[PDB]
């Protein structure tokens, strides 16, 4: 039941100083700590995607590289998770992250993914996301991380068997979607996945119209790519990363 419904246009914007995360689970207070890790570089070129379904395949699969910075200004219900893998078919393993109103399901199986995968609400059905899922080796259900104008930031890394997800929710006063300043991303989950990830894709939710089988919709999200970079992070009195300098400039 794979159907091509999403067309996507893309523009390019500046990351400013977004994308800093806590590199470890160690409390540091009132110090300057220099760490070398996969960070999103300051003032880097970040791709802004507008995905439109109006009521052919024009929604290609993005590369993953060394890790992905994801951002969205959209509401919590439109973007509902992500797809990670290499071939995205039944011959290789894949990771599916699906959020809904009550919880989040993170599940690694052998999914036969559709060319334009989307979660459709009517209750929610995943029959348009994939046609089959066999030999499934990981499942993890927990409290959701897309909850409620509001900028939502995620960092995905795939390092030595662990899929690390970092997140942050920042209330941005109505204006430019990518704001100035710092908002460090707290460690959200470390998943013992152990799979090869070279490509990734965003999952959107589409509503049936009941009036053009699906309601017309748009979703805007920012994707940037992490690079091995040395950062100097400032930890303040309460342990929060309030500032950083990227050592290339
Ligand atoms: C949101 O996702 C959760 C996780 O899958 C759903 O809860 C499960 O629903 C199935 C019914 O197909 C039950 O068999 C499971 O026992 C439920 N698990 C848990 C942990 O509750 C939930 O139904 C989904 N909600 C919506 C609106 O789609
Ligand atoms: C971002 O990349 C595009 C294409 O690679 C390029 O045209 C544009 O100038 C870049 N923007 C910046 C700020 O480097
Ligand atoms: C994968 O699934 C197929 C059929 O679903 C089965 O024949 C095969 O043995 C499975 N392989 C593993 C490693 O589970
Ligand atoms: C990961 O997948 C890519 C693309 O299919 C492949 O070139 C690479 O060798 C794979 N790496 C491992 C460790 O399987
Ligand atoms: C840290 O926590 C204290 C405790 O009340 C608070 O007064 C202060 O505003 C917080 N922030 C900083 C930057 O010290």
Q: Which of 184, 249, 247 is nearest to 34 (CA)?
A: 247
- The torsion angles phi and psi of 28, rounded to 5 degrees, stand at -125, 130
Q: Which two tokens stand for residue 127?
A: 């029959």
> Do 52 and 217 form a contact (C-beta atoms < 8 A)?
yes
> Do 111 and 88 form a contact (C-beta atoms < 8 A)?
yes
Contacts of 34 (CB under 8 A, 6+ apart): 230, 231, 232, 233
Q: Whose CA is nearest to atom 14 of ligand 3?
A: 135
What's the CA gap between 74 and 205, in Å, rounded? 12
> Do 42 and 15 form a contact (C-beta atoms < 8 A)?
yes
What's the CA gap between 142 and 233, in Å, rounded? 30
CATH topology of domain 7-246: Jelly Rolls (2.60.120)
- For residues 208, 213, 219, 224, the Cα torsion angle rounded to the nearest 10 degrees is 120
The secondary structure of 75-133 as a DSSP string is -TTTEEEEEEESS-STTS-EEEEEE-SS-EEEEEEEEEE-SS-EEEE--EE-TTTEEEE
**Cα(98) to centroid(ligand 4), Å:** 25
In the chain, domain spans: 7-246
Distance set, CA 58 to CA 14, 30, 51 (Å): 24, 49, 10
Q: Whose CA is nearest to atom 3 of ligand 5?
A: 238
Q: How many CA atoms lie within 13 A of 235 on its CB side?
A: 16
Q: Resolution in A for the shown PDB structure?
A: 2.9
């Amino acid at each position: 039941q794979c159907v091509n419904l999403i067309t996507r246009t893309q523009s390019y914007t500046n990351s400013f100083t977004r994308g800093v995360y806590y590199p470890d689970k160690v409390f540091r207070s009132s110090v300057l700590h220099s760490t070398q890790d996969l960070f999103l570089p300051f003032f880097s070129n970040v791709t802004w995607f507008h995905a439109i379904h109006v009521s052919r395949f024009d929604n290609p699969v993005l590369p993953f590289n060394d890790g992905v910075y994801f951002a969205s200004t959209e509401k919590s219900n439109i973007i509902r998770g992500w797809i990670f893998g290499t071939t995205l078919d039944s011959k290789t393993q894949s990771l599916l992250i699906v959020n809904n109103a009550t919880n989040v399901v993170i599940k690694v199986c052998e999914f036969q993914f559709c060319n334009d995968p989307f979660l459709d609400v009517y209750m929610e059905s995943e029959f348009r996301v994939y046609s089959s899922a066999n030999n499934c080796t990981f499942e993890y259900v927990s409290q959701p991380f897309l909850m409620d104008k509001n900028l939502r930031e995620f960092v995905f890394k795939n390092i030595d068997g662990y899929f690390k997800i970092y997140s942050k929710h920042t209330p941005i006063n109505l204006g430019r979607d990518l704001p100035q300043g710092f908002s460090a991303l707290e460690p959200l989950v470390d998943l013992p996945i152990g799979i090869n990830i070279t490509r990734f894709q965003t999952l959107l939710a589409l509503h049936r119209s009941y009036l053009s089988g699906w309601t017309a919709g748009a979703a805007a999200y920012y994707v940037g790519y992490l690079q091995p970079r040395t950062f100097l992070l400032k930890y303040n009195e309460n342990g929060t990363i309030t500032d950083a300098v990227d050592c290339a400039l």
